[PDB]
């Protein structure tokens, strides 16, 4: 027996959240559309590294269209995904986009490493671009296929959201309905390894090697690489940190309420900042677009 309300956050903090997500929205769309136009408008400047920026911009556009709307309404003013296939498709597309962005970060770093250490050796071409984008998208699809079958919109009746208008509609949770509970834990651990452990290790070791040989305005390049690595670490850590907390630790009712109502929106805010910081970092500081 519960009679909640549809609107979750109070007016000031809710308005703050909408405004912040609005800045994320405008930054992402403006930057990524500018990047897509700037790469498309030149046929000659269609280098493979440029196609990597195209894929990154595409992934950030999918993040912008998909992630923050659904995630924001999941905890701002609604508190429930609608329909049954809608939850499945939303989780599918947002995870697809997040994995695509992280893996295209890895691919961009790898292409930079090739162009840095072995300019002529391992000469990568358009076929390499097609192969790497195909494998990135295939990994994004496959790493979530088991997650795309446990998205069940479970019936949460006798739970209500009577607002000022007395909305009448049964609650839902959209929980990972695995055959046994322990599957979700191992799924979370393997996803954490696949997203924040192996890509992060690759990025840090590869940028360390690049900065090491270049240290023999060469320092500014090292500073840029260090800043990019620090960005990818810090802006992405709290989201998976709280996700691991909830999954393994399970906290307790007060702490669980606190993280559900406060920590997760901010953690998602940090993670979605990446798609909006991508075109100002990889676009402006690339300087080939600036000279283009």
């Amino acid at each position: 027996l519960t009679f909640s309300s549809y609107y979750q956050h109070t007016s000031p903090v809710a308005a703050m959240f909408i405004v912040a997500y609005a800045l994320i929205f405008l930054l992402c769309m403006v930057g990524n559309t500018l990047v897509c136009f700037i790469v498309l408008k030149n046929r000659h400047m269609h280098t493979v590294t440029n196609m990597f920026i195209l894929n990154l911009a595409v992934s950030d556009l999918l993040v912008g269209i998909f992630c923050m709307p659904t995630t924001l309404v999941d905890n701002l003013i609604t508190g429930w995904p609608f329909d049954n296939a809608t939850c499945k498709m939303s989780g599918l597309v947002q995870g697809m986009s997040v994995s695509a962005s992280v893996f295209t970060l890895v691919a961009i770093a790898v292409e930079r490493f090739r162009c840095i250490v072995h300019p002529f050796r391992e000469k990568l071409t358009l076929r390499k671009a097609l192969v790497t984008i195909a494998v990135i998208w295939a990994l994004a699809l496959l790493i979530m296929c088991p997650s795309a079958v446990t998205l069940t919109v479970t019936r949460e009746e006798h739970h209500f959201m009577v607002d000022a208008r007395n909305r009448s509609y049964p609650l839902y949770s959209c929980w990972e309905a695995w055959p046994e509970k322990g599957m979700r834990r191992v799924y979370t651990t393997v996803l954490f390894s696949h997203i924040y452990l192996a890509p992060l290790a690759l990025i840090v070791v590869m940028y360390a090697r690049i900065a090491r040989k270049l240290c023999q305005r060469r320092a500014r390049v090292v500073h840029m690489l260090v800043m990019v690595a620090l960005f990818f670490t810090l802006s992405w850590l709290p989201l998976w940190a709280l996700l691991l907390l909830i999954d393994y630790g399970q906290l307790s009712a007060p702490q669980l309420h606190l993280v559900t109502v406060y920590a997760f929106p901010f953690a998602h805010w940090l993670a979605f900042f990446n798609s909006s910081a991508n075109p100002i970092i990889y676009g402006y500081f690339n300087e080939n677009f600036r000279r283009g």
């Binding site: 995904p81 997040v98 949460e156 929980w175 990972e176 997203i195 989201l239 996700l243 909830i246 559900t260």
Partner: peptide, 8 residues
Amino acid sequence: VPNLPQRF
């Protein structure tokens, strides 16, 4: 119990 905020 299984209610949880959405993933990434």
